[PDB]
Design an enzyme around this catalytic site. Structure first.
Site, mmCIF file in Angstrom:
data_model
loop_
_atom_site.group_PDB
_atom_site.id
_atom_site.type_symbol
_atom_site.label_atom_id
_atom_site.label_comp_id
_atom_site.label_asym_id
_atom_site.label_seq_id
_atom_site.Cartn_x
_atom_site.Cartn_y
_atom_site.Cartn_z
ATOM 1 N N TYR A 45 31.042 48.625 54.018
ATOM 2 C CA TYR A 45 31.261 48.792 52.600
ATOM 3 C C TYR A 45 30.524 47.710 51.845
ATOM 4 O O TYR A 45 30.290 46.625 52.357
ATOM 5 C CB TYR A 45 32.743 48.843 52.243
ATOM 6 C CG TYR A 45 33.391 47.479 52.253
ATOM 7 C CD1 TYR A 45 33.302 46.645 51.138
ATOM 8 C CD2 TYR A 45 34.065 47.009 53.357
ATOM 9 C CE1 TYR A 45 33.879 45.396 51.114
ATOM 10 C CE2 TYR A 45 34.641 45.758 53.344
ATOM 11 C CZ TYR A 45 34.562 44.963 52.221
ATOM 12 O OH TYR A 45 35.132 43.737 52.206
ATOM 13 N N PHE A 55 31.420 40.215 44.108
ATOM 14 C CA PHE A 55 30.817 41.178 45.022
ATOM 15 C C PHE A 55 31.238 40.855 46.460
ATOM 16 O O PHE A 55 31.731 39.745 46.741
ATOM 17 C CB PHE A 55 29.298 41.227 44.832
ATOM 18 C CG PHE A 55 28.519 42.124 45.805
ATOM 19 C CD1 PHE A 55 28.046 41.628 47.034
ATOM 20 C CD2 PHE A 55 28.224 43.457 45.504
ATOM 21 C CE1 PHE A 55 27.316 42.426 47.914
ATOM 22 C CE2 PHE A 55 27.523 44.269 46.401
ATOM 23 C CZ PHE A 55 27.057 43.749 47.597
ATOM 24 N N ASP A 56 31.136 41.861 47.346
ATOM 25 C CA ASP A 56 31.634 41.717 48.706
ATOM 26 C C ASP A 56 31.116 42.865 49.555
ATOM 27 O O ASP A 56 31.100 43.999 49.107
ATOM 28 C CB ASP A 56 33.150 41.707 48.745
ATOM 29 C CG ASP A 56 33.797 41.655 50.126
ATOM 30 O OD1 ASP A 56 33.299 40.923 50.985
ATOM 31 O OD2 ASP A 56 34.829 42.325 50.326
ATOM 32 N N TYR A 101 44.571 46.918 42.561
ATOM 33 C CA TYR A 101 45.414 45.737 42.508
ATOM 34 C C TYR A 101 46.151 45.647 41.174
ATOM 35 O O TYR A 101 46.866 44.659 40.967
ATOM 36 C CB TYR A 101 44.683 44.425 42.666
ATOM 37 C CG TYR A 101 43.978 44.346 44.000
ATOM 38 C CD1 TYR A 101 42.716 44.893 44.183
ATOM 39 C CD2 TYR A 101 44.592 43.768 45.100
ATOM 40 C CE1 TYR A 101 42.112 44.896 45.439
ATOM 41 C CE2 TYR A 101 44.014 43.803 46.362
ATOM 42 C CZ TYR A 101 42.768 44.370 46.542
ATOM 43 O OH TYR A 101 42.162 44.266 47.755
#
Ligand SMILES: COc1cc([C@@H](C(=O)N2CCCC[C@H]2C(=O)OCc2cnc(C)s2)C2CCCCC2)cc(OC)c1OC
Length: 128
Positions: A45, A55-56, A101
């Site tokens: 992902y 970002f991740d 979340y």
């Protein structure tokens, strides 16, 4: 760019049909089947806040992300979204806070009432 397209053209994959989770298939996968709830799924992902400020990627850690589908171990949008995917598929998800979340967020990575965007690749799945 990707986020906007998704708002305009994405499929609503919520049960409540509240457009809290929209999806576009970007690369068609293989097989006739998606994973069943409770299957172990393996994904890559790339994720960000809709505004691009955090970002991740699982590629940053050179390690697929693994979870048991539909078992509530991750944000709701993932349980719902990955369950719609086929092996080999890449999909774009745009996700309102209620399916991520929420208002509490999860600082410092995610703030209050954040929309998330993910590109997910479904590498593989097995009914463990
Ligand atoms: C609030 O916690 C975290 C959330 C994520 C990302 C995130 O929100 N994820 C990680 C990929 C799976 C969906 C979603 C999530 O359910 O996170 C709970 C985690 C489960 N396992 C993790 C290592 S974090 C977040 C997406 C948008 C850009 C900002 C990162 C990565 C995180 O670290 C890689 C993380 O810290 C543990």
């Amino acid at each position: 760019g990707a986020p906007a397209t998704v708002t305009e053209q994405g499929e609503d994959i919520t049960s409540k049909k509240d457009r809290g989770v929209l999806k576009i298939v970007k690369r068609v996968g293989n097989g006739e089947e998606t994973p069943m709830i409770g299957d172990k799924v393996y994904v890559h992902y790339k994720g960000k806040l809709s505004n691009g400020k955090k970002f991740d990627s699982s590629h940053d850690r050179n390690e697929p992300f693994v979870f048991s589908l539909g078992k509530g171990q991750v944000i709701k949008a993932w349980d719902i979204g990955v369950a719609t995917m086929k092996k080999g598929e890449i999909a774009h998800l745009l996700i309102k806070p209620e399916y991520a979340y929420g208002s509490a967020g999860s600082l410092p990575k995610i703030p209050s009432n954040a929309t998330l965007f993910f590109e997910i690749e479904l590498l593989d799945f097995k009914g463990e």
